[PDB]
Amino acid sequence: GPIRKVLLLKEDHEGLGISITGGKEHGVPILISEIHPGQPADRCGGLHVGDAILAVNGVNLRDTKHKEAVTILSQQRGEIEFEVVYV
């Protein structure tokens, strides 16, 4: 699939509005498993269930354990770039 770079905007009190699965120990990419209605990922309109998150704000998440990916994702603020591909 083609890589897309997608901007998500959120305020600090918000989460990203996604659930993710996967990570290095699981032998699979970080994948979006749910998009939460009204939350930032839904609002931006460019992130979908089944998208792999390859990177966020230039942090490579292709070879990172689940929890470390969660932590990096959870530290992002403001306008946040997702590098994704539908697999």
Binding site: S19, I20, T21, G22, G23, S33, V70, L73
Partner: peptide, 10 residues
């Protein structure tokens, strides 16, 4: 095996 997905809301 424990029946649980690895899934986190973030």
């Amino acid at each position: 095996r424990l029946q649980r997905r690895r899934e986190t809301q973030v």
